[PDB]
Design a protein around this ligand. Structure first.
Ligand SMILES: C[C@H](C[C@@H](C[C@H](C[C@@H](C[C@@H](CCN1CCCC1=O)N1CCCC1=O)N1CCCC1=O)N1CCCC1=O)N1CCCC1=O)N1CCCC1=O
Ligand SMILES: COc1cc(CCNC(=O)c2nc(-c3cccc(C(F)(F)F)c3)[nH]c(=O)c2O)ccn1
Ligand SMILES: [Mn+2]
Ligand SMILES: [Mn+2]
Length: 180
């Protein structure tokens, strides 16, 4: 209790995103009061996922991340049963109604190369698109198909570097980097 990471997450991120990240950690047996770095990562991942869905058209994306585990699996069943795409192994983040594929969003504190390899080895049915962002402004997507336009993607990298900057200004970034 009483971690600077917790008060920064509550001050930096959206109240709804903080609430959405708290439920996800509660449900998966984690405690944002103590597991404060994973609390900051869950909030960051949520925000990026929400800006990404805002980058396309109105009915472009279906948001999977940010729903309770049971409701998230229900909507992918409807997506699989009306489109014909195969059921993803683990839960993804989005679905592309324009490109007809699921999307896996990733935010990393390392080389964009390593994370995607990790995210690719657990989805052997490589039908799901994988998209990595980085806190240093680098990105990395499947088949070089970065899905969105450059302006929407650049907005994501800008916000990511602001979070890393605010984290470092409070001497929190060093603990956040050497923990992923
Ligand atoms: C409605 C409720 C929650 C939605 C919220 C989700 C997030 C969206 C919020 C919008 C407003 N903006 C835009 C400006 C800032 C802001 O705050 N953005 C996008 C940027 C960051 C953010 O926060 N979106 C997306 C569509 C419109 C909307 O509101 N969520 C939560 C998880 C899944 C979901 O659809 N719903 C709807 C049914 C299920 C549920 O929980
Ligand atoms: C906190 O609730 C959870 C939930 C799960 C299963 C569901 N998870 C996802 O869907 C997911 N998780 C991450 C992620 C972010 C930081 C650290 C880690 C890891 F260190 F645990 F690997 C993963 N990034 C994504 O992009 C992503 O989609 C697992 C654990 N905790
Ligand atoms: Mn997810
Ligand atoms: Mn993800």
């Amino acid at each position: 209790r009483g971690s600077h990471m917790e008060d920064f997450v509550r001050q930096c991120f959206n109240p709804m995103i903080v609430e959405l990240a708290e439920k996800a950690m509660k449900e998966y047996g984690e405690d944002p009061k103590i597991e404060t770095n994973k609390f900051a990562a869950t909030c960051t991942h949520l925000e990026v996922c929400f800006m990404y869905s805002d980058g396309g058209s109105k009915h472009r994306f279906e948001i999977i991340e940010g729903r309770d585990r049971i409701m998230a699996w229900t909507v992918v069943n409807s997506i699989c049963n009306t489109t014909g795409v195969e059921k993803p192994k683990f839960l993804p983040d989005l679905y592309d109604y324009k490109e007809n594929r699921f999307i896996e969003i990733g935010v990393t504190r390392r080389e964009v190369h390593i994370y995607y390899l990790e995210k690719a080895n657990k989805i052997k049915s490589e039908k799901t698109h994988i998209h990595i962002f980085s806190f240093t402004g680098e990105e990395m997507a499947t088949k070089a198909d970065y899905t969105l336009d450059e302006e929407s993607r650049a907005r994501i990298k800008t916000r990511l570097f602001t979070i890393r900057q605010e984290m470092a200004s409070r001497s929190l970034w060093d603990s956040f980097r050497q923990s992923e």
